[PDB]
Design an enzyme around this catalytic site. Sequence first.
Site, PDB file in Angstrom:
ATOM      1  CB  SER B 143      39.289  34.334  45.920  1.00  0.00           C
ATOM      2  OG  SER B 143      39.425  34.230  44.545  1.00  0.00           O
ATOM      3  CE1 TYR B 157      43.524  38.054  46.135  1.00  0.00           C
ATOM      4  CE2 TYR B 157      42.910  36.083  44.844  1.00  0.00           C
ATOM      5  CZ  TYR B 157      42.547  37.279  45.451  1.00  0.00           C
ATOM      6  OH  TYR B 157      41.268  37.711  45.425  1.00  0.00           O
TER       7      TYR B 157
HETATM    8  N1  LIG Z   1      37.450  39.464  40.810  1.00  0.00           N
HETATM    9  C1  LIG Z   1      37.441  40.205  41.894  1.00  0.00           C
HETATM   10  O1  LIG Z   1      37.313  41.457  41.950  1.00  0.00           O
HETATM   11  C2  LIG Z   1      37.638  39.404  43.173  1.00  0.00           C
HETATM   12  C3  LIG Z   1      37.531  37.990  43.113  1.00  0.00           C
HETATM   13  C4  LIG Z   1      37.677  37.229  44.289  1.00  0.00           C
HETATM   14  C5  LIG Z   1      37.832  37.874  45.476  1.00  0.00           C
HETATM   15  N2  LIG Z   1      37.965  39.264  45.519  1.00  0.00           N
HETATM   16  C6  LIG Z   1      38.213  39.846  46.788  1.00  0.00           C
HETATM   17  O2  LIG Z   1      37.261  40.805  47.095  1.00  0.00           O
HETATM   18  C7  LIG Z   1      37.744  41.828  47.996  1.00  0.00           C
HETATM   19  C8  LIG Z   1      37.439  43.164  47.302  1.00  0.00           C
HETATM   20  O3  LIG Z   1      38.123  43.212  46.061  1.00  0.00           O
HETATM   21  P1  LIG Z   1      37.697  44.312  44.889  1.00  0.00           P
HETATM   22  O4  LIG Z   1      37.918  43.583  43.582  1.00  0.00           O
HETATM   23  O5  LIG Z   1      36.448  45.031  45.334  1.00  0.00           O
HETATM   24  O6  LIG Z   1      39.025  45.245  45.061  1.00  0.00           O
HETATM   25  P2  LIG Z   1      39.360  46.805  44.750  1.00  0.00           P
HETATM   26  O7  LIG Z   1      38.325  47.194  43.701  1.00  0.00           O
HETATM   27  O8  LIG Z   1      40.791  46.701  44.176  1.00  0.00           O
HETATM   28  O9  LIG Z   1      39.079  47.592  46.065  1.00  0.00           O
HETATM   29  C9  LIG Z   1      39.960  47.350  47.134  1.00  0.00           C
HETATM   30  C10 LIG Z   1      39.413  48.032  48.341  1.00  0.00           C
HETATM   31  O10 LIG Z   1      40.244  47.514  49.436  1.00  0.00           O
HETATM   32  C11 LIG Z   1      40.876  48.645  50.037  1.00  0.00           C
HETATM   33  N3  LIG Z   1      42.228  48.296  50.586  1.00  0.00           N
HETATM   34  C12 LIG Z   1      43.309  47.873  49.910  1.00  0.00           C
HETATM   35  N4  LIG Z   1      44.375  47.647  50.782  1.00  0.00           N
HETATM   36  C13 LIG Z   1      43.899  47.978  52.023  1.00  0.00           C
HETATM   37  C14 LIG Z   1      44.411  48.028  53.388  1.00  0.00           C
HETATM   38  N5  LIG Z   1      45.723  47.663  53.581  1.00  0.00           N
HETATM   39  N6  LIG Z   1      43.643  48.448  54.404  1.00  0.00           N
HETATM   40  C15 LIG Z   1      42.337  48.842  54.188  1.00  0.00           C
HETATM   41  N7  LIG Z   1      41.823  48.802  52.987  1.00  0.00           N
HETATM   42  C16 LIG Z   1      42.477  48.413  51.881  1.00  0.00           C
HETATM   43  C17 LIG Z   1      40.916  49.803  48.994  1.00  0.00           C
HETATM   44  O11 LIG Z   1      41.049  51.086  49.694  1.00  0.00           O
HETATM   45  P3  LIG Z   1      41.415  52.344  48.709  1.00  0.00           P
HETATM   46  O12 LIG Z   1      40.080  52.744  48.091  1.00  0.00           O
HETATM   47  O13 LIG Z   1      41.795  53.394  49.754  1.00  0.00           O
HETATM   48  O14 LIG Z   1      42.293  51.982  47.584  1.00  0.00           O
HETATM   49  C18 LIG Z   1      39.554  49.574  48.317  1.00  0.00           C
HETATM   50  O15 LIG Z   1      38.488  50.089  49.127  1.00  0.00           O
HETATM   51  C19 LIG Z   1      39.225  41.546  48.131  1.00  0.00           C
HETATM   52  O16 LIG Z   1      39.480  40.843  49.383  1.00  0.00           O
HETATM   53  C20 LIG Z   1      39.539  40.640  46.956  1.00  0.00           C
HETATM   54  O17 LIG Z   1      40.649  39.747  47.210  1.00  0.00           O
HETATM   55  C21 LIG Z   1      37.845  40.002  44.373  1.00  0.00           C
END
Ligand SMILES: NC(=O)c1ccc[n+]([C@@H]2O[C@H](COP(=O)([O-])OP(=O)(O)OC[C@H]3O[C@@H](n4cnc5c(N)ncnc54)[C@H](OP(=O)(O)O)[C@@H]3O)[C@@H](O)[C@H]2O)c1
Lengths: 247, 248, 247, 235
Positions: B143, B157
Site C-alpha cells: 500500500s 495496517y
Molecule cells: N484502497 C484499497 O482498496 C487498497 C489500497 C492499498 C492496498 N490495498 C490492499 O490490496 C489488497 C486487496 O484489497 P481490496 O481492497 O481488494 O480488499 P477487499 O475488497 O476487502 O477484498 C479482500 C479479499 O481478501 C480476502 N481475505 C480477507 N481475509 C482473508 C484471509 N484471512 N485469508 C484469505 N483471504 C482473505 C477476501 O475473501 P472473502 O471474499 O472470502 O471476504 C477478499 O477476497 C489487500 O492486501 C489490501 O491491503 C487495498
Amino acid sequence: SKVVLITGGSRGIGAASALLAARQGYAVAVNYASNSAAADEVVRQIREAGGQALAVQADVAKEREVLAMFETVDAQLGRLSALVNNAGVVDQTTRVDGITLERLQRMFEINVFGSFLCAREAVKRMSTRYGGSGGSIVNVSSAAARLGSPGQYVDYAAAKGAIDTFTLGLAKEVATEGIRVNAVRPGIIETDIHASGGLPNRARDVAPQVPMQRAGTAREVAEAIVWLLGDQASYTTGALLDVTGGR
Amino acid sequence: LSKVVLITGGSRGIGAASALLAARQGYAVAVNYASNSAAADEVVRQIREAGGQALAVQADVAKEREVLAMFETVDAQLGRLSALVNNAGVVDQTTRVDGITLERLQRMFEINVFGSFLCAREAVKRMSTRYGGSGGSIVNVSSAAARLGSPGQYVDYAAAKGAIDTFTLGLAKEVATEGIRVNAVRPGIIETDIHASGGLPNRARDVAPQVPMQRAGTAREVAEAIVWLLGDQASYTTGALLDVTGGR
Amino acid sequence: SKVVLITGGSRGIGAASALLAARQGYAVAVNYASNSAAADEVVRQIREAGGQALAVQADVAKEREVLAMFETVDAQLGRLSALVNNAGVVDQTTRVDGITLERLQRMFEINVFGSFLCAREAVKRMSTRYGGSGGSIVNVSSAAARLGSPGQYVDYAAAKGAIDTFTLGLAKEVATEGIRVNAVRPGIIETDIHASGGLPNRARDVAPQVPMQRAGTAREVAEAIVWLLGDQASYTTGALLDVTGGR
Amino acid sequence: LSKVVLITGGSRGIGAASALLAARQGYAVAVNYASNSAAADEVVRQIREAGGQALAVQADVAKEREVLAMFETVDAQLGRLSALVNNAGVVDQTTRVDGITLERLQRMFEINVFGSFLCAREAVKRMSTRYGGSGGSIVNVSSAAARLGSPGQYVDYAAAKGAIDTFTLGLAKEVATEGIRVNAVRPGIIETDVAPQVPMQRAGTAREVAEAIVWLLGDQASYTTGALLDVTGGR
Ligand SMILES: NC(=O)c1ccc[n+]([C@@H]2O[C@H](COP(=O)([O-])OP(=O)(O)OC[C@H]3O[C@@H](n4cnc5c(N)ncnc54)[C@H](OP(=O)(O)O)[C@@H]3O)[C@@H](O)[C@H]2O)c1
Ligand SMILES: NC(=O)c1ccc[n+]([C@@H]2O[C@H](COP(=O)([O-])OP(=O)(O)OC[C@H]3O[C@@H](n4cnc5c(N)ncnc54)[C@H](OP(=O)(O)O)[C@@H]3O)[C@@H](O)[C@H]2O)c1
Ligand SMILES: NC(=O)c1ccc[n+]([C@@H]2O[C@H](COP(=O)([O-])OP(=O)(O)OC[C@H]3O[C@@H](n4cnc5c(N)ncnc54)[C@H](OP(=O)(O)O)[C@@H]3O)[C@@H](O)[C@H]2O)c1
Ligand SMILES: NC(=O)c1ccc[n+]([C@@H]2O[C@H](COP(=O)([O-])OP(=O)(O)OC[C@H]3O[C@@H](n4cnc5c(N)ncnc54)[C@H](OP(=O)(O)O)[C@@H]3O)[C@@H](O)[C@H]2O)c1
C-alpha cells in the site's frame, strides 16, 4: 497514431524503446546527438516493419536545438502523446576528489537539464491546461540514484538522484492536466555506455554483483518504459520502477 | 495445459480484477477466499465462461494447515504453480496507536504479513529451480500506507504493509538465482469494499481530493500492474515496489 | 529529573543507552526479560556514577507485563518523559522457504507488537491531550529494514520495516501533542545478539562488507538514540537515522 | 589545537547559526559568503567577541578558481580543515516546469550542486588519510524537498536537493576508509505562527538545523556516514 519522442533513441535502451513503441503502434521520433547512422538504422527497422518514424538531431543540453526538435516533430509527425527522456552519458571512472567543473557541467546538462527542457516542451503540448489531450513522460534514471556509484561516478549517480526527485515533483505538478510522469531505474544493462566510459567488460564483470547474476538487456528496459507510457498504467504517476535484477 | 496463478483473496476487489485479467492472459487461476464462496464462485464462473480455467479454493491465510491444504489442492487440480499474488488483506476500524489492542495487532499482522510469508514459503518450495521447479513470479500487495504511515487511521495496517515492502526486497534477493522474481504493488486509494469493511464506506470519494490525480483508482488499474509484474515482460524486474497511487 | 524507560536495557545497545541516558540526567528504568543479573549490573553502574535507576522485568510481548511495568515506573520513578523501544531478537539463519509460523509469531510479537504496546502506554502518559507534558520515543530499527537480510532472516528484516513505517505513522499521529517519535537504524554492531542466532563471529565476518570496514559499538548507537531523545533534536520527528558505517 | 570548519553560505540563516554553534563547541570557523560581507563580518564579530576564532572568506562556490582560493586562504590563515558544511544554496521564484529556463536551471544547479561537489573535492584532498590527512566530516544541507518534489513551486530546486542526497550516499561510501564521514541534513520549513502543512504545526528554527549539523560533524556520530537526517517537524 500516437507520437512518441525518444531522446537518445539511436542506440541501446533508447533504440530498444523505439522499436517496441513502434510495434505497439506509436509513430516514433528518434533523437540523436551526432550518430545519424545509428538513428537512421533504427528508423529503417521501424519502417521496414510497417511503422512510422523520423530521425531528429538535437543536443538536449542546447535550448534552441530542443525547440527546433519539438517543432520538427510538430510539423512532421504531429503533436506528441509521449516523451522518453533517455539521452544520457557516463564518463570515465573517477573519485569525487578528481572531479572537474567541466565534467560536472556536462554530466548534469545532458542527464538533467536536457530532461527538464524536453519535459517543458512536452508539457506545453500535452497539458489539458493548454488544450492538449494529455500524455505520458518516462524519465530514464538508474539504480545509481539509490546506490551512489562510489569510486566510479558519484556525479552520474547524483544526476540520476535529481531525475528521481524531478519525476516525483513533475508528476505531482501536472497530475490534473492529463499527464503522467514516471521513471525507470535500470541496473547493469548490456549497452555501449560502459565502453564509452572506458569499461567495455563492465556488464560481464559486475554480473556476479547482481542478485539475478546477469546483466539486463535493453529490450527488458524498453518493456518497462513502454508499459509506463501506455494506458495500462493509467493510475501510475510519480512511480520509480526498478529494472535491475535485484540490484 | 498453461501457467497456474494462485491469487489470495481472489474473490473480490483487486484480487478478483487480477483473477479476471490473469485468465485473459492465459493463466489458470486458483481463486482463494476466506469465507465468501459466492463471490469466488462468481469469479470462477466468469473465467470459465470466457474459456479460461479456474478453481475456487477456501483458506484463511493466517492458518498454516489451511495454506498447506490450499497448495495441495492446487497441486492436484491445476498443477505446479508458476505465479502467486499475495493479495489477501484487511483493514480495521479507525484508531490511534494509543487505542490499539494486542488482539487487533495480532489479526492485522497474521493476515496481512504472516499469510504472505506462509504462501510465499509454499510457492518458493514449488517454483525454485533448486528443487527442480521452473521458476516463477510472486507479487505482494502492499500500500502507499507503507510510505505514509496512516496516522490517526491505522498505523498498524501501515506498518504491516511496511513489513511487506521489506519482505519483498529480502525475498527477491534471496531467490534471485532460483528463477523466481518477487515484486510488490503499492496501491493508493482504490474503489473496493475494503473501506466500508473498516467503517469508512465513502473513503475513496472523501480522500480523492488528497490524491494528485484527484480520483480514486480502480481495481482493474491495480490488476494491470500486478499482471504486468507477474509476466515475462518484467523479466529483469525483481525487488521493485510499484506505486499505483495517482501520485499519492 | 526526566524519566526514561529502556526496553531490553540489560545488555548491548539497550545497556549502552541506559548508561548514556543516565549521564545526561535521566532517571532510568532498565527493562529486562529474564537476565536479572545483567540488568542489576547496569543499574549498579548507573548508581555508582551518580544516577537514578531501577531494574524492571517484563516480556514486552505480554500485555499484562507491559502494563505492570509502566505501573511500576509510574509508582517508583514517576511519569516517563522518554521511551526507547530497543527490546528485540533475531533467530537462527533461515531462508523464507524454511520459516515456520511459530518463528514468525515470535519475531513479530517481540520486535513489533512489543514496540506498539510500549508506545501505546507511553503516549497515554506523555500526550498533552491527556494532561501530559510531552515526550520522546526512539524505536530501534535496523539497516535490515532497507536491505532485507536475504538468506539470513527476511522475517527479522520485515519486522524492522514495520518499525520504520510505525515510526513515521506514529510521529505524524502525535506531532501536535508534544511527542516526537524517531528511529535509529543500526548496522552490524558488536553485541551478543549475533551469537543468540548462532553466528558469534558475525560482527567480524561482515565487517569487510561495511564501507567503514568495521562493526559499530553499542555506545555509538546509544549516542544517536540519546541525541534523538533530547531537546537538541526538537524539530526532528519521523526521522530514520542510520548508524551503520555506510551500510 | 582547534579543529577548523568551513561553512559555505555562513553569513545568514542556517549557515550563520551553524557557525555560531560550531564556535561554541570549540571550532575555528571560516564563514563563507558570496557578496554580503557585512553579514559575514557580523557573524565573525559575534564569534570573536564570545572568545572564538573566525574568518570571513568571500567565494562564489560555483566558481572553481574562487573555491580554490578560499580553501588556500583557510589553509594559510586557519589551518587544515577538519570539517565542511556545504550550506550555500538558493531557491528562486515560484515556477512550474513548463516555465523553467536553462539560465534558471544553470544557476540552481551550479550553486546547490556543483558548489557542493567542488567544496567536497577540496575538503577530501585535505582530509583523506590516503593523502596523509587526519580525516574529517562533511555535512551537506539538503531539504525535505528532495523527497517531496516541490510541485508547482520549484521542482528544479527539489531535484538539485535530490542530487545532494545521492551525492551524500555515494561520497560517503567512496571515502569511508579514509577517515571521512559524509552526511546530510534535510531541513523542512525553517523560519527567517501556525505552519499548517507541518505535522508539528510550526516552522523550525535555524538553530534547530544547526544542532543536527554540528552533531553529525562531531565524534558522537562516529559510525554515522551516508545518513540523511530530517529536521522537518514531520514533513
Ligand atoms: N484502497 C484499497 O482498496 C487498497 C489500497 C492499498 C492496498 N490495498 C490492499 O490490496 C489488497 C486487496 O484489497 P481490496 O481492497 O481488494 O480488499 P477487499 O475488497 O476487502 O477484498 C479482500 C479479499 O481478501 C480476502 N481475505 C480477507 N481475509 C482473508 C484471509 N484471512 N485469508 C484469505 N483471504 C482473505 C477476501 O475473501 P472473502 O471474499 O472470502 O471476504 C477478499 O477476497 C489487500 O492486501 C489490501 O491491503 C487495498
Ligand atoms: N547499464 C546501462 O546501460 C544503464 C544503467 C542505468 C541507466 N542507464 C541509462 O539509460 C539511458 C540510455 O543509456 P544506454 O546504455 O542505452 O546508452 P548508449 O548505448 O550510450 O546510448 C546513448 C544514447 O543517448 C544519446 N545521447 C547522448 N548524449 C546526448 C545529447 N546530449 N543529446 C541527445 N542525445 C544524446 C546517444 O546518441 P548518438 O547515437 O547520436 O550518440 C544515444 O542514442 C541513459 O539515460 C543511461 O544513463 C543505462
Ligand atoms: N547488530 C546489532 O546488534 C543490531 C543491528 C540492528 C538492530 N539491532 C537492534 O537493536 C536492539 C538491541 O539489540 P542488541 O544487539 O543490543 O541485543 P542483545 O544484545 O541480544 O540484547 C537484548 C536485550 O533485549 C532484551 N529482550 C529480549 N527479548 C525481550 C522481551 N521479549 N522483552 C523485553 N526485553 C527483551 C534482553 O533482555 P535479557 O537481558 O533479559 O535477555 C536484552 O536486554 C534490537 O531491537 C535489535 O534488533 C541490533
Ligand atoms: N525553509 C528553509 O530555509 C530551508 C528548507 C529546505 C532547505 N534549506 C536549505 O538550507 C540552506 C541554507 O538556507 P537559508 O534559508 O539558511 O539561506 P539564506 O538565509 O538565504 O542564506 C544563504 C547563504 O548562502 C550564501 N550564498 C548564496 N549563493 C552563494 C554562492 N553562489 N556562493 C557562496 N555562498 C552563497 C549567501 O551569501 P550572502 O549572504 O553573501 O548572500 C548566504 O550566506 C540552503 O542550502 C537551503 O536550500 C532551507
